[model samples]
Target: MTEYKLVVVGACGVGKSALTIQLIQNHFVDEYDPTIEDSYRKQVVIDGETSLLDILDTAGQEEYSAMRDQYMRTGEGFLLVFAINNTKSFEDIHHYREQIKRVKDSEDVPMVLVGNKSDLPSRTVDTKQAQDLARSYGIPFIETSAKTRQGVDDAFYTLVREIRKHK
Candidate 1:
């Protein structure tokens, strides 16, 4: 059983937790619980290859930087997610990348930049900016909608494939 740690980092309400839920459990929660701090660990088994996934759905707010730092250190790969319609969440990707660098400081770790919430087309931020940022950081990027499950598996499987290939 190969173990992998994938961390989802973004500001609050950016749908990091939602993406994780969709990826791990194949479901959705539409109730909008804002006060919940964190979720439990989720294990993912792909094609009988099991990975004990330590999914760090860190808070979006800056106050959780300490906990964020702790998770960043242990992350084997990252899903730096942001809403397609939220520019602030897009901007925060750089900050999250910096934090990942601060802790990991390795060029080998695979990262996938996810522009989540693609279901809302009317509120899209600059697609070019997202692409350029991903390019600048040397990471893979994809626009995704956990609601529709578009690009969800691709965003995650791509990183997992990269990591496995690297290993």
Candidate 2:
């Protein structure tokens, strides 16, 4: 079995923890509490192959910038997430991607650009725009809703596949 270290990064209130919880525990959470940093380990089967995932849900606060660098350094792949209802959060993807490239020192790093909160009725960012951005970065893009557990699995599995492909 393969082991993958994945980190979730996004702006504040973007549901990074929610997505992580949904994937790891198969449950949905309604509340939002800022995360300092949390780690989880889960055995996942993709394409009939079992692998272990070490996932890090990171803090969105600027105070945790130093901590983010450390997390980025150790991550083998990344889920660069943003809330579709919040345009500002979506805008921050550029900064997060830049940080990942800087820390990993590779433009071909494995990553997926995720637009979360797809179940919400009010979306500030368009799917095409996000797709365009992901295409520009040469990464895959997925829309996920942690509340309804929609596309959450696809997001994680896709990232894992990308990581394994790069390896």
Candidate 3:
């Protein structure tokens, strides 16, 4: 089995777990609490290919600023999640990217930028801005709504494809 460690790093209520569920079961969970612990695991299959995903759903509330670096250094892949309606989450992407760079020291670690909660109207962070940010980072970007199950597969599979390119 080709195993991978996927780190979903973001602030709380950004739909990290929801995205994980959508990718694994092809559906979304309407509500979920922030993971207080350090890590979780889920098995996912895409294109009839099974892979074990060790997800590090880090605490979003704490200023785990240093921890982000650690996760990025150890993770093989990263999915940076941000809420579409929250601009703070969007702005924070820069710091997160910087942290990842410091630890990984690679601009090409198969990173995927996720704009979650796309179904919500009045999004403070629009597609154009997200795309621009992702472009600046040289990573793939997509808007996703775990509630409607929209763009979930695109987000997950896109990351998988990025990783495959490296392999």
Candidate 4:
């Protein structure tokens, strides 16, 4: 099977782990726990083609920033995630995208800008703003809610399709 390496990166409490788990296991996690780094493997079929996805759910804490370069290097595609309720988290994607480009030495890297926590009542970042930023970067933008499992599959499937397109 074809294999794709994907990395999920965002600020703390943005639900990177929650989203990853939801996609791989179809379950939702209610609590927040900081991740150092964790890898998950699963076989999935998208658009009639089967592929193995090796996902790296990364830590969002500032202390883990030192290890981000290593993760960035291994990622063939990325989910640049952020919480819609946190403005700072949304802003961090700029840095993450630049870092990935630097590590991969290619501006054409495949990625999706994911604004998670769409089910929440409080949201600080506007959807248009996120879409505009993604448009500027020429990447796809998706909003997801891990708790409700909304848009989760669409986000992952979009990333996988983009990875294939680049290859």
* Model 3 lDDT per residue over 1-167, tens place: 66777777776778888887776666777876674545566666877888777766665466656755665577777888999999998888877777766688876677899999988877898799999999988899988888888887687677777877888
Each model's lDDT: 0.76, 0.90, 0.78, 0.89
Off by over 4 Å in 2: 64-67
Q: Which ten residues in a row have the lowest lDDT in candidate 3?
A: 35-44
All models, RMSD in angstroms:
2.5, 1.5, 2.5, 1.7
Candidate 1: worst-modelled 10 consecutive residues by lDDT: 31-40
Could you tell me every candidate's TM-score relative to the true structure?
A: 0.83, 0.94, 0.83, 0.93
lDDT of 4 by residue, 21-95 (tens): 998889998874684568899999999999999999987456535456676698999999999999999989998
lDDT, candidate 1, 32-60, per-residue tens: 45555464465667667876666667654
Error of 3 at 89 (Å): 0.8
Residue 99 of model 2, lDDT score: 87
Q: For residues 5-96, what per-residue lDDT tens digits would candidate 2 score against the true structure?
A: 99998888888999999998888877757845788999989999899999999874576366557767999999999999999999899998
If both were scored by TM-score, which would come out higher, candidate 1 or candidate 4?
Answer: 4
- What's model 2's lDDT at 129? 99
